[PDB]
């Protein structure tokens, strides 16, 4: 038959591309399988083209060669890149027509009941580019494109040829060729998902399990969980790196290379190798989309008082409301407090606790030296990306630093303010939900600009006020002993205090530099001299 008798889906070793292969089989091979009588009754024509594209290392070449193997017909012809160009005039067309001459001859000799011929073009963009938009040094490229267009669909009709083309930049291809009759079906290959990442990891480990060379402590599901945004090539590279790390432990190089050969017949791969490789060898080519929450939360969170729990509960309530509402697709909230209170860390924690698919943080740390237009463009891009997902959450921190505010005159950038005021009231497309969390340290200034009314609610973040809270914080950090704690309490318990947690940490670190007989005193002075505040 036209299909190899032994062919089956499982044998080609493809990963998680179930839908795409099914679509190809539906839209490309349905007609050739039905009996000639009914297809003749419909009198419909047959597809002749396919255009695969996507990011590098997804499986395009693998899919093409597997399709070639699946079909029982003449050995596929392969055009390896720009091998068809020649210096002599008129010889490129000679090759481009020699490719199709055999199929033309067979179709002439047998007619409608002839076999099928398959031709594979690799790096099509190298050959075929827009005729008008091209170098003027030589018209060779235009003649080549015209010859290909004439041969594929000319006055003479040929109907027993299938052409496969793979590329990476589909835009450059000429429009005249991507029309029905030449290449109508156009797929897009993308990064796999967790299930695809599990299937891919399974396809390679098979032999090691078969020969009992893999330790039982390895959990493939966990590995698939950690490896986010990876591709098939990167997964295979990770496997190879773990294998090499395991193998390296039986060679004594660096003076002269030797192998044990008697302690080297009991080799096995543990989970430690995979963990080591995942941090040293392989990094995802596609930049990790997960935010680096460690940078924003550098010392965790400690429950030194009720306000922390109150703020977290309010954030959870807001998240629930935005998740389970339909009359109000857009919600906003503002966190305000005195400096050195830990607003950014709390906002980051609130964002993390939610499980929304899309989460991003916009900070001025990246916009150094930028003009007042670059900032607007960056914010627009971030919000455009957020609009795509069904549920989105965005965090804007250090608003006053984002407007370039200075109290002398005063001065600020108007364009950014207007853009923000417009983006705080633009609802997303139908059937989508968005949440915005803003952070600031000067509420009166925002009140003056008349943007405090643009938000929906406000949350207050206080700083340490009573000596008991200070003692609790010291206990949680545990940087002083009981004697020193009693000494400090004897003084602090009498009155009240006013200090932020970050400044408290800085003061502790500065104090610990003195000799043991002085540290406590060094601490007290620093609290007394700087502690003058309401």
């Amino acid at each position: 038959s036209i299909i190899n008798p032994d062919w089956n889906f499982e044998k080609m070793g493809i990963g998680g591309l179930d839908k795409e292969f099914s679509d190809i089989f539906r839209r490309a091979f349905a007609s050739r399988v039905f009996p000639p009588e009914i297809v003749e009754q419909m009198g419909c024509k047959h597809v002749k083209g396919i255009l695969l594209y996507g990011p590098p290392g997804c499986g395009k070449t693998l899919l093409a060669r597997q399709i070639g193997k699946m079909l029982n017909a003449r050995e596929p012809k392969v055009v390896n890149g720009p091998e068809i160009l020649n210096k002599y005039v008129g010889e490129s067309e000679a090759n481009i027509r020699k490719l199709f001459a055999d199929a033309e001859e067979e179709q002439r000799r047998l007619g409608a009941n002839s076999g099928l011929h398959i031709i594979i073009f690799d790096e099509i963009d190298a050959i075929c580019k827009q005729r008008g938009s091209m170098a003027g040094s030589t018209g060779v490229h235009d003649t080549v494109v015209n010859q290909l267009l004439s041969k594929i669909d000319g006055v003479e009709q040929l109907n027993n040829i299938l052409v496969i083309g793979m590329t990476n930049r589909p835009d450059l291809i000429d429009e005249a060729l991507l029309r029905p009759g030449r290449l109508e079906v156009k797929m897009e290959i993308g990064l796999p998902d967790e299930k695809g990442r599990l299937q891919i990891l399974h396809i390679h480990t098979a032999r090691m399990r078969g020969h009992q060379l893999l330790s039982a402590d390895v959990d493939i599901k966990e590995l698939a969980v950690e490896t986010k945004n990876f591709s098939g090539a990167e997964l295979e590279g990770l496997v190879r790196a773990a294998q090499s790390t395991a193998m390296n432990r039986h060679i004594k190089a660096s003076t002269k290379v030797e192998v044990d050969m008697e302690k080297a017949e009991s080799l096995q791969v543990t989970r430690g190798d995979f963990l080591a490789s995942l941090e040293n060898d392989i990094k995802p080519a596609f930049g990790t989309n997960q935010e680096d929450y460690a940078s924003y939360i550098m010392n965790g969170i400690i429950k030194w008082g009720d306000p922390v729990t109150r703020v977290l509960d309010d954030g959870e309530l807001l998240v629930q409301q935005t998740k389970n509402s339909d009359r109000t697709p857009l919600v906003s909230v503002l966190l305000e407090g005195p400096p050195h209170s830990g607003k950014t860390a709390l906002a980051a924690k609130i964002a993390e606790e939610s499980n929304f698919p899309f989460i991003k943080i916009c900070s001025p740390d990246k916009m150094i030296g930028f003009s007042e237009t670059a900032k607007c463009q960056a914010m627009k891009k971030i919000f455009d990306d957020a609009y795509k997902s069904q549920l989105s959450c965005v965090v804007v921190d250090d608003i006053e630093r984002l407007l370039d505010y200075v109290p002398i005159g005063p001065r600020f950038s108007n364009l950014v303010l207007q853009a923000l005021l417009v983006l705080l009231k633009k609802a997303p497309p139908q059937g989508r939900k968005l949440l915005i969390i803003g952070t600031t340290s000067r509420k009166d200034v925002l009140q003056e600009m008349e943007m405090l009314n643009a938000f929906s609610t406000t949350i207050h973040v206080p700083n340490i006020a009573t000596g008991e809270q200070l003692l609790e914080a010291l206990e949680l950090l545990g940087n002083f002993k009981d004697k020193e704690r009693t000494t400090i309490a004897q003084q602090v318990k009498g009155k009240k205090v006013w200090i932020g947690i970050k400044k408290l940490l800085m003061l502790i670190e500065m104090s610990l530099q003195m000799d043991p007989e002085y540290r406590v005193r060094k601490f007290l002075a620093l609290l007394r001299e700087e502690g003058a505040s309401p």
Binding site: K87, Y88, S137
Partner: peptide, 16 residues
């Protein structure tokens, strides 16, 4: 307006 810079060239050989 700055005049366009210089350009390279490509050559084609013919056989008699």
């Amino acid at each position: 307006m700055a005049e366009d810079a210089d350009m390279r060239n490509e050559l084609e050989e013919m056989q008699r």
